[PDB]
Each structure stands twice: as structure tokens, then as C-alpha cells.
Amino acid sequence: KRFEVKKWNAVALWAWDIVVDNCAICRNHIMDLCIECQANQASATSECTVAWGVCNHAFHFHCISRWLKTRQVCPLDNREWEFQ
Amino acid sequence: EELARYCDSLLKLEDTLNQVMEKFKKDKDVFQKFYAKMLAKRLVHQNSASDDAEASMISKLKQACGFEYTSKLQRMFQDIGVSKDLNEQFKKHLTNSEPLDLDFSIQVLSSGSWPFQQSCTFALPSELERSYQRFTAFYASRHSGRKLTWLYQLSKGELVTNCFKNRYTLQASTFQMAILLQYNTEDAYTVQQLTDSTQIKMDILAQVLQILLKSKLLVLEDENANVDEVELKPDTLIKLYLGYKNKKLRVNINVPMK
Amino acid sequence: MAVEELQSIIKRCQILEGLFQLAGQRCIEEGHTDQLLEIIQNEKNKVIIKNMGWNLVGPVVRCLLCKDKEDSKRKVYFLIFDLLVKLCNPKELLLGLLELIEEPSGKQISQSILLLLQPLQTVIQKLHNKAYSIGLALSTLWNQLSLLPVPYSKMDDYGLCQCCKALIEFTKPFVEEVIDNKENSLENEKLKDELLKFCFKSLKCPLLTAQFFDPFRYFASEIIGFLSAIGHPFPKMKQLADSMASLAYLVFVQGIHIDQLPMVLSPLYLLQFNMGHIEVFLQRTEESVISKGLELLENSLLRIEDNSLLYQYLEIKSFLTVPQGLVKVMTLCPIETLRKKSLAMLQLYINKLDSQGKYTLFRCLLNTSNHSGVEAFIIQNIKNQIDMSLKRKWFTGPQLISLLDLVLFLPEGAETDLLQNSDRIMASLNLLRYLVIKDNENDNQTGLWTELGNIENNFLKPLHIGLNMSKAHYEAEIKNSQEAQKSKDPPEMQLKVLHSALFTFDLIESVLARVEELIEIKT
Ligand SMILES: [Zn+2]
Ligand SMILES: [Zn+2]
């Protein structure tokens, strides 16, 4: 291989990330409507809801449900999932 | 202006410092801009004579013009130390895993206090990836909530060559490295192909090729072509020259652009 | 002995028409201050002490200053002081007093300023003629005074507050002078110039970092007051930009002298004038200064009705630069409250702008902010607009698409970093999720049906590609990190930092896998 990298001296700048209160799975403000339900004609199910698991990070029940039909776990950290 | 430059040209004892500090009293802000830049360069490039002396200069300015005048200064310094300890920790954290085949360092800077800006479009070379992948995920462990912005155009490295009659150490820009590395695939590349690959804005890429071409390593289809003149084009062909020779084994190809 | 020398130098120089200073220092230092006064009194000889004795001021003024005071010692010093201020030729005197410029620093500045302010008057009036003098004394005074830090809710150790009230007392007589004059004579002119010069100084340094309930209200009031007292009242009002932004804040936020200004009261009219000042506040790094800027923006913005703010207002610079300046502080500033606040102010701003104004500001912040988070925020907002933007536009047709090319554009798209690109991609993916759900193909008020194929090519697939490449790299780096670890015979926790990344991928995929499930299902 004609070119081999011996050293690399790199510069990087850091800034702060911005923080907002969001369903991480879909992204919509917690306290606000889950997105699929924002795109919905007003429905029975249209009254998704705040769910918390033991891990303490929180989701729209709507979103975390379809997350839990697939894996058994929590998406953010990784833990098998029980409510609170 | 030069009232500033003089200090960095001298600093590139504390007596000869104070001997400026008198002339300091004499529009100190536009001065502090320039002096900042001076310091910044003296920092990222390492060097800068005696560090304790730089600190004594700072703290000398501290009481003089008060807190906010200095503070960005102080932030650059402690940013440097912070980077030293960062690198230490990283070398220790990798110590249980497969090592990096290259020799890695990074200075991380507070985006706020440093003049440096805007990064550039760039495509990180695969050979450069794992280092990056590893350190990114490391910083995220030491600080959540932070974002890292890599400034390649200030990033330098060392290539080692296997295809020459002789083995060279090339001290190069990261744009240089990214270009050259492209030659482990093919022996000739059109400039277009090189922007579609290293993702380097053509405006920049041109000057960079011009440097490499000036360097022995790459060559045009036209041998009679003056590289200090001829204007490179999308379909222009850049060839690797295996005829390369140097009376130096470790050679630095990374040079002020003109 | 030094006394004898002093007398020898007197009788030597008392015929005619530097060491002299030295014998003064000595005589004053531990020993007799008595015979010094015994020399000056009897008022012989006036000519030297007139042309010379000002030299003795410094050692005296240190023997006042450096001395702890609280003494019946000092009054004998004060005597010879006053006697000096009385008998000395004025031109060379204040200069000595202006030695204060250098002489102290930090906490012990005030006591110098407080001590010599009166003599500075008595001298300056002695020469009626010069404004240039006052210019000098005010300049130097403000120089020294600018150095001391500005307190909040604090008794003050540095003496800044009493020094500002004291300055006001000093300055009044000079501004009460010009208020009444027959003549236009140039001395009056240059006196006005120097005066208001000092007013822009004080407007600038002390008041710009100052916080309010209030000695800084008294100071502001009294200075801007001086601005009315001379010509060019504040209402009419480079490098003065700091002074002017301080003034703007002082008037509009603190309501100081707000009465003189015309009623206005259309929040628009004030806004467009004030925006510039806000920008000048936000470019600053001080917490106090950033805070003030934010307050002025919020205040200006509170009054405006939602979606009033007209597109064409963005054709003023501050109107674009300021949201940017907000994005600056959100990301770059130490103080979290300020970051959270700045984010808020951004969202308020967006809210005020009319539809196309929003679209414009989005498009700008997308290609400007260069932060994947604030890009995700911008995406959110766009989704909100699209939603609202249908009942009976800018967020619907090819304009929307033009705006989509910007969000769904993949930088180095196949290989992008999805670790730090994770949030903007989550945003974009949810926005899609909405779009494919809301409108049918064959209804198609939105966007997409035309773009869908081109999207799945230029966004969706390469995102699959990227996810794959990524999970692969990360799994591998891990497994063989273990292989390395075991082959070497702290504890492997070091690896968890990687596991995190895997989650972030499996998150996205679950989202992506969902979108396509719809992309077919609703097709
Ligand atoms: Zn959700
Ligand atoms: Zn729902």
C-alpha cells in the first residue's frame, strides 16, 4: 500500500449541544402530540400520552409502543423495559 | 499593529517583557485582537518558546487591563493544558484495545475563544477514520452535551511512502494526506475526480495540487507546463510520479500556500 | 540632615529666574513634617513654591494615601497639601495630580480618586480658560475608573459606586457652566466636545456591564441628563455603537428619561431601530452584557402580535444577524440559563415573523448555523409551519421542496457521521413521516409525491448504506477490542462508550424502517 499514515495531529473546536424536551423516538415536544397523531384526523387513539420507564427517560406511549412490538428494550440507554 | 507583532516575534527576560509593558500604556482592543491571533498561532503549532513566560505575560496583562481583556487568552492556555490531559487520558483509554497504527494527537479548543472558523467541506480518508471514530466516542464519554467540530485545514500529519525507489517520510497537510492517499487506488486522477472524492472545494484544491505538483510527487501530462502559471481544470489530469527523489528522507511538503 | 539640604537648595534657587523634589521626599519620610510647614508658612518664598513646590505633592499624597489615616497625625499633612494647592502654578499641578493615572491600581484606586477630586476642581477653575484641561482630567479619571469590576447586589470594596457619584459631583459644575452662556466662543465648544466625549465613555464602560434594581440609575440619569444639558440630546443619537447600545438599553428597558422621547408605541417602529443595539449586545461575551441584550430583544418582541413581523424587515442586516447572534450564544456561551433563554428568544422571534419571513430565516439558519441540533430545531419549526400552513403557500409547493433539498441533503451522504448527524436525521425522518401520512398521492397538496423516488435515492437508500457501514464498523471495533483485550493475557468498561453508538443506529433504523412501511402502505 503506497501511502501509509504514520502520524495525524488534529484540531477540533467544541461547542454546546442544544437541549429541548422531546420524544426521542419520533421527535415532538413531550407535553405535545406524538407525530403520527399530529398527522392524524382526530381519533379515538388520538387520546397518545406521556409514558415513563424505570430508566426515567420519557416517551410518547404511542412511539414507545411500536418500539416495543419489535425489540423488548428501551431505545435510549439499553434496558428491558418496565413502566413507572 | 506592529506594537503587537513585536511581542510574538520575540516570544516565538520578563525584563524584556516589561520593557514592552511600558510602551503598552502609550486603542488597546484592536491591539488585543492581533495579539490574540498571534498567541493562537503560537499555540496550535506548539513551539512558542517558554510557556511559563507566556503565562507571566498574561497574568501581567491581567491586573493591568482587568479580567475580560485577558479572559479569552486564559481560555486558550488552559484549553492547551486541558488538551494535554485529554490526550493522556485517551492514550490510557485505548490501552486496552487494538492500538492505532498511526501516532495520534488532538488539541480540543473552546470554539468561543479561538479565532479559527468555519472548518471546510472535507471527506475524511478511511485510513483516518478509526482514529476519529474512537476519539469522537471518547469525548462523548467525558462530556455529554458537547459538539465537536473538526478543523482539518489546521490539521497536519505524516505520510510514509512504499512505492518510491526510496522510503520517505512526508510531513503534510491533511488535505495533502487526503489527496496522496487517493493514489493507493489508481495512478492518475482528473481534478474533477479529486474534488468528488476528498470533497475539497475546488478553489482550495487547486492551490493544494499546485503545491504538490511543485513537490516532486505529482505531475501533469505536460512536462513543459509551468505549474506556477498553468491554471488547473476539471478534466486536468494529475499523475503520481514514481520517479520521485529526495536528498532528504523526512521531507516536509506542507508549506505556506504561495 | 535632609532638611538642611532642602534649605540649602531653597536659598540656592531663591535668587534666580529636581533634587529639590528628593529632599522633599526625604524630609517628609520618617522625621519632621514640621519644619517643612515652618518653611512654607510666612509665605516666603512664593516664587519657588509657586513654580516648584508642586513637586512635594506626591510624597505628601502617598503619606496621606499609604498612611492608614484614622489619625490626628495626618491633619498636619492636609494643611501643607491645601497650602500647596493654593500656592502652586496651576499648569504643572494637575499633571502631578494626574499621576494618579498610574499610581494606584485595584482596590486602592478609589481612595486616590476620592482624595484628589476636589483639588482637581480648585486647580482647574484657577485657570478659567482651558477646556482641554478638563478633557484631560476626565479622560484619565475615566481611564482608571473603567478598570474596576462592576458589582451586583453588593457595600462595594472597589469603590466604583461612590466613585461614580463622586464623578457626577465633580462634572456637574462643568456642565452647569455651559448651560448658561452668551458666547459661542470656541472654548465653550471644545468644552462641550470633551464633556459629551466623557458621557459616551461613561455610557460605554461602566453602564454597559452594570445591572439594575440604584447608583447606576443615578449615574445613568445624571449622564444622559448631561447629554440634554449640552446640545445633541440623546433622542437624536463609529465605535460609539457600544455607548449607543448602552443608552438604548438604559432608555427603553430602564425607562430612564423616557419621557422626552416621542410616543411612538408601535412596537414595530421601535423594533427596527433597536435591533441594531441588540446585535451589538449579542456580539459581546460578558454574561451581564449578553443578558441585557436578551432582555431588550424580549421586551421589543413581547409587544408584537404573532406573525406580524413582515418579510421585508429581513432586508435590514440586524434582522438576520441577530437570530444568528442568538444561535451563537445558545451554543458557545458558558451560562446555561443564557443558552436556554437565547433558544427561547429564537423561538419567539420565529413566531413573530410572517410566513415567508419564517421560510427565509429557516433557509438561512440551515446553511449558516452549522450545528446539527439547531438544524433539528429548525426542522421541527418547518414541520410546524407545514402543519399550520394548511388551512386555506410558502410551506406547500415547489418552495417547500426547494426547502427540502436543504434538509434531506446528505453531506458526504453515503459515509456521513451519523453519530453527530443523529439528531438532524431524526428530525428529517420524522418530518417525512408526517408528510407521507398527511396527504394522499392524488391529493398531494404537499410536496412529495413528485420527489419521493428522488428522495429514496438521494436520502433514504444511502442512509440504509450508511447505517450498515456504521453498525458494521462499530460491532467490529468492539469484538476485536475484546479479542485484543483477552489476547493480552480499566476493566473493559472502556468499551461501553461504543455500545452507545449502536443504539443510536438501531434507533434511526427503527424510524427509517417505519417510514418505508408507510411509503409503500399509503402508495
Ligand atoms: Zn414521540
Ligand atoms: Zn399518538
From Swiss-Prot, chain A:
GO CC terms, sorted: Cul2-RING ubiquitin ligase complex; Cul3-RING ubiquitin ligase complex; Cul4-RING E3 ubiquitin ligase complex; Cul4A-RING E3 ubiquitin ligase complex; Cul4B-RING E3 ubiquitin ligase complex; Cul5-RING ubiquitin ligase complex; Cul7-RING ubiquitin ligase complex; cullin-RING ubiquitin ligase complex
Residues binding Zn(2+) 3, per UniProt: 55, 57, 74, 77
Entry keyword Signal: no
GO molecular function, one term: zinc ion binding
Domain free text: The RING-type zinc finger domain is essential for ubiquitin ligase activity. It coordinates an additional third zinc ion.
Annotated function: E3 ubiquitin ligase component of multiple cullin-RING-based E3 ubiquitin-protein ligase (CRLs) complexes which mediate the ubiquitination and subsequent proteasomal degradation of target proteins, including proteins involved in cell cycle progression, signal transduction, transcription and transcription-coupled nucleotide excision repair. CRLs complexes and ARIH1 collaborate in tandem to mediate ubiquitination of target proteins, ARIH1 mediating addition of the first ubiquitin on CRLs targets.
Family per similarity comment: Belongs to the RING-box family.
Protein name: E3 ubiquitin-protein ligase RBX1
From Swiss-Prot, chain B:
Expression sites by tissue: Expressed in lung fibroblasts.
Posttranslational modification: Neddylated; which enhances the ubiquitination activity of SCF. Neddylation prevents binding of the inhibitor CAND1. Neddylation leads to structural rearrangment in the complex that allows interaction between the E2 ubiquitin-conjugating enzyme and the acceptor ubiquitin. Deneddylated via its interaction with the COP9 signalosome (CSN) complex.
GO BP field: animal organ morphogenesis; cell population proliferation; G1/S transition of mitotic cell cycle; intrinsic apoptotic signaling pathway; positive regulation of canonical NF-kappaB signal transduction; proteasome-mediated ubiquitin-dependent protein catabolic process; protein K48-linked ubiquitination; protein monoubiquitination
Keywords: Host-virus interaction, Isopeptide bond, Methylation, Ubl conjugation, Ubl conjugation pathway
GO cellular component: cullin-RING ubiquitin ligase complex; cytoplasm; cytosol; nucleoplasm; nucleus; Parkin-FBXW7-Cul1 ubiquitin ligase complex; plasma membrane; SCF ubiquitin ligase complex
Sequence similarity: Belongs to the cullin family.
Protein task: Core component of multiple cullin-RING-based SCF (SKP1-CUL1-F-box protein) E3 ubiquitin-protein ligase complexes, which mediate the ubiquitination of proteins involved in cell cycle progression, signal transduction and transcription. SCF complexes and ARIH1 collaborate in tandem to mediate ubiquitination of target proteins. In the SCF complex, serves as a rigid scaffold that organizes the SKP1-F-box protein and RBX1 subunits. May contribute to catalysis through positioning of the substrate and the ubiquitin-conjugating enzyme.
Record's protein name: Cullin-1
Parent-protein start and end of this portion: 420 to 689 of 776
Curated annotation (Swiss-Prot), chain C:
Keyword Phosphoprotein: yes
Documented effect of changing residue 514 to A: Disrupts interaction with RBX1. Loss of inhibition of SCF (SKP1-Cullin-F-box protein) E3 ubiquitin-protein ligase activity
Protein origin, superkingdom: Eukaryota
Region annotation Important for interaction with RBX1: where it falls in the sequence: 258-523
Expressing tissues: Ubiquitous.
Pathology linked to this chain's protein: Glomuvenous malformations: Characterized by the presence of smooth-muscle-like glomus cells in the media surrounding distended vascular lumens.
Protein name (record): Glomulin
Taxonomic source organism: Homo sapiens
